[PDB]
Amino acid sequence: SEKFAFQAEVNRMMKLIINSLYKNKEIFLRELISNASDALDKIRLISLTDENALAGNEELTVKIKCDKEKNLLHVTDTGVGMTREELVKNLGTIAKSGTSEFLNKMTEAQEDGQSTSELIGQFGVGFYSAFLVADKVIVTSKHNNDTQHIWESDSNEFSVIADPRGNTLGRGTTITLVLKEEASDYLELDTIKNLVKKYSQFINFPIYVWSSKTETKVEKTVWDWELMN
Ligand SMILES: Nc1ncnc2c1ncn2[C@@H]1O[C@H](C(=O)NCCO)[C@@H](O)[C@H]1O
Numbered sequence: 540s541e542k543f544a545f546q547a548e549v550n551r552m553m554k555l556i557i558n559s560l561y562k563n564k565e566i567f568l569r570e571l572i573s574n575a576s577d578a579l580d581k582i583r584l585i586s587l588t589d590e591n592a593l594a595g596n597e598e599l600t601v602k603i604k605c606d607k608e609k610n611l612l613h614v615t616d617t618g619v620g621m622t623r624e625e626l627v628k629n630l631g632t633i634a635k636s637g638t639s640e641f642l643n644k645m646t647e648a649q650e651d652g653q654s655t656s657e658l659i660g661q662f663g664v665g666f667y668s669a670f671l672v673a674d675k676v677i678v679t680s681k682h683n684n685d686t687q688h689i690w691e692s693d694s695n696e697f698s699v700i701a702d703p704r705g706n707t708l709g710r711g712t713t714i715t716l717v718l719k720e721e722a723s724d725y726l727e728l729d730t731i732k733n734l735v736k737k738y739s740q741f742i743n744f745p746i747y748v749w750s751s752k753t754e755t756k757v758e759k760t761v762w763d764w765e766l767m768n
Contacts, residue, residue: 570665
């Protein structure tokens with residue numbers, strides 16, 4: 540449907556982030572998990588004021604799935620979600636007041652030889668680190684005040700469409716990563732489980748990985764959400 544170019548500062552930001560974490564690519568998952576935590580924190584706080592805030596989906600979880608066969612990684616939360624306008628502005632521009640400070644602090648850091656990965660985490664701009672391991676990033680989101688929408692980008696542009704599938708999330712957001720060939724190891728359950736456990740121990744919400752256990756030629760395989768924190 541509707542196509543957009545990234546704001547120039549976001550193009551600059553993306554490159555800064557990519558270069559900062561280029562040799563620590565796994566950090567992308569830490570940031571997606573941190574963002575999902577923030578979104579969950581937000582709807583939890585809204586529920587203090589809105590008696591019907593959780594009506595679209597009564598759960599408060601992060602859920603992560605590998606799809607080796609389709610080369611996809613999904614990170615789904617039932618947090619606050621994003622309206623169409625929010626997908627466009629939050630992901631495509633320097634929206635928040637603090638974000639603009641990131642760019643300056645990031646540059647002053649890289650000159651003074653200070654660590655920068657803490658800056659990415661502190662300012663919550665880690666979403667773009669997804670492009671370290673993904674050729675395409677897809678964001679499906681449902682907010683109580685809007686219909687379900689899909690944002691998609693290969694980092695050279697982005698587009699937003701209303702989801703033709705309707706409201707499948709209930710409430711929350713899915714980050715779908717179309718993984719680079721070099722990043723296929725993030726499709727392995729053992730790798731993902733190890734990373735999710737490392738980055739979710741400090742999160743105040745339950746995080747699940749869609750895992751499998753095979754028995755016993757005759758084989759029996761059991762699929763279900765394995766709690767990681
Ligand atoms: N899972 C997520 N759920 C709800 N909102 C999310 C989200 N992941 C990112 N966002 C929103 O997009 C913004 C964002 O990550 N912009 C890119 C860096 O500035 C976040 O500040 C947040 O407001």
